[PDB]
Every structure is written in structure tokens, then in C-alpha cells.
Amino acid sequence: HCERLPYDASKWEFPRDRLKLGKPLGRGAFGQVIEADAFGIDKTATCRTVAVKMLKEGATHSEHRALMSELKILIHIGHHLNVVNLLGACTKPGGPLMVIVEFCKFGNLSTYLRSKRNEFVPYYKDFLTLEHLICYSFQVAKGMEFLASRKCIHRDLAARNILLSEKNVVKICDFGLARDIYKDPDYVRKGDARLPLKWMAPETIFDRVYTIQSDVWSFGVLLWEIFSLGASPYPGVKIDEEFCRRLKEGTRMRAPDYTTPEMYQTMLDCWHGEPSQRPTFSELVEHLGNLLQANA
């Protein structure tokens, strides 16, 4: 019910003429993310590279409404290190709606991890390590615990929706309309929609129920993505009626190549058939904190 949420223009509004738009970072059918240089958006008179989400040719007012609600919910949620951080917006009549967020150096985590297979050691500068992987996992859990505290749920948690910034900081985001879900293999046709079936809890697939505990299921799939270094979930499996049936039966993914035993058990915990029996994000924060310390 985001339509009732406030937009404080005096706080958030940024002039369009102080935003210099550049190269596209991601494009969907109706939306896009573009790199930009913003003059004095978060620090007085200093240029800052940012990312801005806006609509594309083909978009209608319905997509405009959706982007406005997205802005409003980001304001409601507020700032956390592990959520993509809202810097401002351009909402004034006479131009397109633009939502401005912090630029994350390395882009989406799925593509990044997939690029580091030859630059990984469990325990070499700029090499990824097991510590990095557990650290990213811990950070996403922290971000999701925060989102839950704001009475919000994600509904599309996956490595493609995690951003990697400098100093190994990861941030939860949602590309949304800026992703081409009709062309993206991660989204499968189900009824009158294209859905991320491989990341979805059984109750979401079968009953269309979305809760923080279905986000926990998705977090388990995310963990699998991290510890496979960006592999595609359910390798060599056709995503059809039989897949969904077997999933409800209790079929689960095998351990990914770079996992630890306790990380794999954590995945299995997140994939409990009963939503209430899955760990909470607060439990996951505690556990992954312990695992990160045990690693060091």
C-alpha cells in the first residue's frame, strides 16, 4: 500500500540540470539504470558518480506509478550499509521520474563472482577467499534483517539483485523494470507473469504466498550462488511441473563447489519445507557472524 507513503521533496528532490547522464548499466523493456555524475548530491559542491533508475520508451504511466512507489518505499526503509542507498530523486513535472542511488563499483554479484573462478583461493592480491564469501553472506543477512525490521519483504532475492561496492561491501537492491525479464533465463513463464522460479519457496510457487520466510528460502539459493561462485541454480534441471513437484517432495540442490559443511547445512535450513521452521534473518545473522569468526 505504498501509494499512501510520503515524498518529502524538500529533503529528496535533486535538480535535473545537476545530473549528467552517461552510459547504460542495465536495460529492461520499460526501465533502465544509467550511470551519471551528480553535482553536490550528498556532499556540498562535490561531484559524485551515481546510478539512476528511470523509465524507457515503451513505458506507460502504470510503470511511472510503480517507480514512484519504489521511491516512496526506499524512503520508508531508510539507510543501512547493506541496502542500496537512496541519494535523491527527480520528480518535478517537465521531465522523467529519476531515482538516484549510490554507485556500486563492481555491479551485480552474480556476474562478478562468475568472473573470479580463476581468482579464488579458499585461504594472491585481489583474489577472492572463503572469508570474502562468508562475509558477503553475513552482510546480505544483515541487510535482510534490516529490511524485515522495516516491515518490508524483497520478493526477488538473488545474486543478480546484490551489488558489490568498494571495500567488500555488498548491498541488497532490486533492478526491477531495469531488467529484461522476458529475455532473462532466470525468469520463467508461469500463468500471466515471468517469475524467478528457481529462487522461489514452494508456498510461493503453489499458493502465491510471499513472506519474510519465503525470502529466507531465496536467501538459501543466494548462498548456493555465492558458494558456487555465481553458478546457475539447479544445474541440468528443466524448470517445469516436475521440478515444482519434486521441490515440494523434498528434493534439494547438492553442495556447491566452494562451500563449507556448515554453509551447506545453512542452505538446507533455509530450504525447510515449513516456512516457520526456517531460520529467521536474525538467526542467520547470529549464525553467519559465528561462522565468519570461526573462519578468522
- Is 145 among the residues that bind ligand 00J (CB under 6 A)? no
Q: Most distant CA pair in the chain: distance in Å?
A: 59
Is 25 assigned to a binding site? yes
Tell the smallest beta-carbon distance from residue 158 to ligand 00J (Å): 12
Residues in the chain: 296
Tell the smallest beta-carbon distance from residue 208 to ligand 00J (Å): 22
What CA–CA distances, in Å, run from 294 to 59, 130, 139, 200, 282? 49, 12, 16, 30, 19
What CA–CA distances, in Å, run from 215 to 19, 112, 135, 210, 274? 35, 22, 19, 8, 13
- Is 33 among the residues that bind ligand 00J (CB under 6 A)? yes
Is 30 assigned to a binding site? yes
Tell the smallest beta-carbon distance from residue 200 to ligand 00J (Å): 19
Tell the smallest beta-carbon distance from residue 176 to ligand 00J (Å): 6
Is 28 assigned to a binding site? yes
Burial class (CB within 10 angstroms; exposed 0-12, middle 13-18, buried 19+) of 112:
buried
- Is 30 among the residues that bind ligand 00J (CB under 6 A)? no
Phi then psi for residue 140, to 5 deg, are -65, -40
Residue 104 vs 197, nearer CB to ligand 00J:
104
What is the DSSP annotation of 205-217? HHH----HHHHHH
Residues 82-121: x where in contact with ligand 00J by CB under 6 A, - otherwise, as a string: --x--------------x-x-xx-xx--------------
b/e string for 46-67 if b means 16 or more Cβ within 10 A?
Answer: eebebbbbbbbeebeeebeebb
Is 138 assigned to a binding site? no
Is 265 assigned to a binding site? no
Alpha helix positions (H), 91-159: 109-114, 130-149
Phi then psi for residue 44, to 5 deg, are -50, 120
Catalytic position from the list 8, 42, 126, 156: 156
Among 12, 14, 19, 25, binds ligand 00J (CB under 6 A): 25
- Is 53 among the residues that bind ligand 00J (CB under 6 A)? yes
Task: Give the integer Cα–Cα distance in Å for 213 and 25.
Answer: 31
Among 128, 163, 231, 263, binds ligand 00J (CB under 6 A): 163
Q: Which of residues 167-186 bind ligand 00J (CB under 6 A)?
A: 173-175
- The verdict on whether 156 is a catalytic residue reads yes
Tell the smallest beta-carbon distance from residue 131 to ligand 00J (Å): 22
Is 53 assigned to a binding site? yes
Distance linking the first and last C-alpha atoms of the chain: 44
Residue ranges for the known binding site for ATP are 25-33, 53
Given the rule CB under 6 A, which residues bind ligand 00J? 25-26, 33, 51, 53, 70, 74, 84, 99, 101, 103-104, 106-107, 163, 173-175
Q: Which residues are annotated as a binding site?
A: 25-33, 53
